[PDB]
Amino acid sequence: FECQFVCELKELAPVPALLIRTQTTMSELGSLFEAGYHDILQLLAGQGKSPSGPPFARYFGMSAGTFEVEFGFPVEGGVEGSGRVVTGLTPSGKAASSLYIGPYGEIEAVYDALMKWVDDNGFDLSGEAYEIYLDAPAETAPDQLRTRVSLMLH
Numbered sequence: 086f087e088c089q090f091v092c093e094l095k096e097l098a099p100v101p102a103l104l105i106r107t108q109t110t111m112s113e114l115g116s117l118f119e120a121g122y123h124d125i126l127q128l129l130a131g132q133g134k135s136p137s138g139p140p141f142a143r144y145f146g147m148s149a150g151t152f153e154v155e156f157g158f159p160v161e162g163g164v165e166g167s168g169r170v171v172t173g174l175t176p177s178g179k180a181a182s183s184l185y186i187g188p189y190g191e192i193e194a195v196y197d198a199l200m201k202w203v204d205d206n207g208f209d210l211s212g213e214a215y216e217i218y219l220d221a222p223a224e225t226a227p228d229q230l231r232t233r234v235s236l237m238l239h
C-alpha cells in the first residue's frame with residue numbers, strides 16, 4: 086500500500102453510536118461482528134430507527150490472542166440501548182487515516198503504510214485503531230470492498 090497520495094490526518098467529530106464493548110480473538114471476530122451487528126440493527130428496528138452511517142470497530146492490543154473491541158453503528162440521538170448494546174460516541178481527536186479497497190485479510194498492508202507515514206511526519210500513536218466498514222462484506226466483491234482505516238494519534 087502506498088501512502089504518497091491518499092493518507093491524511095483527519096479531525097474526527099464524535100457523534101452518537103450504539104455499541105457493543107467486549108473482547109474477542111481474530112478467529113472469532115467475524116462471527117462476533119455478524120451476531121452483534123445483527124443485534125444492533127434489531128435493537129434499532131426495535132425502536133423504529135435506522136443507522137445514520139456505516140458500522141465501525143475500535144481496536145487496541147490486536148496482537149494479543151484476546152483483545153478488546155468496541156463495535157457498532159452511528160445513530161441519531163434519542164436512541165436507547167438495551168442489554169450489552171450501549172449508547173456512546175464515535176471517536177474524537179486526530180487520526181492518521183486512509184481508505185483501503187480489498188479483502189480484510191490483506192488490510193495489514195494499509196496498517197504498515199500508515200505507521201510508516203506517521204513516523205515520517207513525526208506523529209505519535211495512542212495505539213488505538215479505528216475501522217469504518219463502508220461496504221457490507223457479505224454483499225460486496227472483495228476487489229471493491231471499502232474500509233477506512235484510521236490510527237488514533239496521541
Ligand SMILES: CN(C)c1ccc2c(-c3ccccc3C(=O)O)c3ccc(=[N+](C)C)cc-3oc2c1
Pocket residue numbers: 114115118119120122123139140189218219220221222223224
Ligand atoms: C455498510 N453496512 C451497511 C454494513 C452492513 C453490514 C455489515 C456486516 C454484516 C452485518 C450482519 C450480518 C452480516 C454482515 C456481513 O456483511 O457479513 C459486517 C460483518 C462483518 C464485518 N467485519 C469487518 C468482519 C463488517 C461488516 O460490515 C457491514 C457493513
